[PDB]
Amino acid sequence: HEVLLRSTETGQLLRINPDGTVDGTRDRSDPGIQLQISPEGNGEVLLRSTETGQLLRINPDGTVDGTRDRSDPGIQLQISPEGNGEVLLRSTETGQLLRINPDGTVDGTRDRSDPGIQLQISPE
């Protein structure tokens, strides 16, 4: 059961790249967009790339990238629904919201008014 994470604003899909960078793409054939949700209990989940096995990480400096370190505190995420299939994704450790920017860069923010935090999650 894989899912795709998508910006409501632009339709750009979140991608975890083989080089560990995380960004957005409109390429539905990119293998870096297929993600697996793994429950950690207590309302937390991990997001893992099927293609390379890398985990999505939101870092304390606001950068977002891929890691293999299961002990990294930045991998714990919470999916908070806003209604009608729109969600916010936050780091447990720092409370930062994942943001997909219109230029396809991906980073962390605290701005609840930022259009790039508005995400959709759909099954593959």
Side-chain angles (χ1 to χ4, degrees), residues 14-51:
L14 185 129
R15 164 171 80 145
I16 301 173
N17 295 299
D19 67 4
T21 63
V22 169
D23 67 349
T25 184
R26 286 296 296 273
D27 183 11
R28 179 68 178 83
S29 81
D30 196 295
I33 66 176
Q34 278 79 25
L35 307 181
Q36 295 167 30
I37 298 172
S38 69
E40 295 285 270
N42 308 298
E44 306 181 282
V45 300
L46 309 184
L47 281 177
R48 193 193 296 273
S49 162
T50 289
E51 199 64 15

Side-chain angles (χ1 to χ4, degrees), residues 4 51 62 67 80 88 124:
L4 305 183
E51 199 64 15
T67 186
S80 288
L88 301 186
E124 249 248 3

Side-chain angles (χ1 to χ4, degrees), residues 91-102:
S91 155
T92 297
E93 194 69 10
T94 59
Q96 295 175 103
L97 295 143
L98 184 139
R99 171 168 72 167
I100 308 181
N101 300 294

Side-chain angles (χ1 to χ4, degrees), residues 43-110:
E44 306 181 282
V45 300
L46 309 184
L47 281 177
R48 193 193 296 273
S49 162
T50 289
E51 199 64 15
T52 53
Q54 289 174 105
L55 301 158
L56 183 69
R57 174 175 71 158
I58 298 179
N59 298 296
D61 65 2
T63 63
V64 171
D65 58 1
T67 186
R68 299 197 178 283
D69 182 6
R70 280 287 232 111
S71 84
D72 193 300
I75 65 176
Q76 310 294 331
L77 311 171
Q78 309 179 14
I79 303 169
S80 288
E82 280 166 301
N84 200 37
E86 304 285 308
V87 311
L88 301 186
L89 186 74
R90 278 181 191 83
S91 155
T92 297
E93 194 69 10
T94 59
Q96 295 175 103
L97 295 143
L98 184 139
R99 171 168 72 167
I100 308 181
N101 300 294
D103 66 357
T105 61
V106 170
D107 65 349
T109 185
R110 304 200 177 282

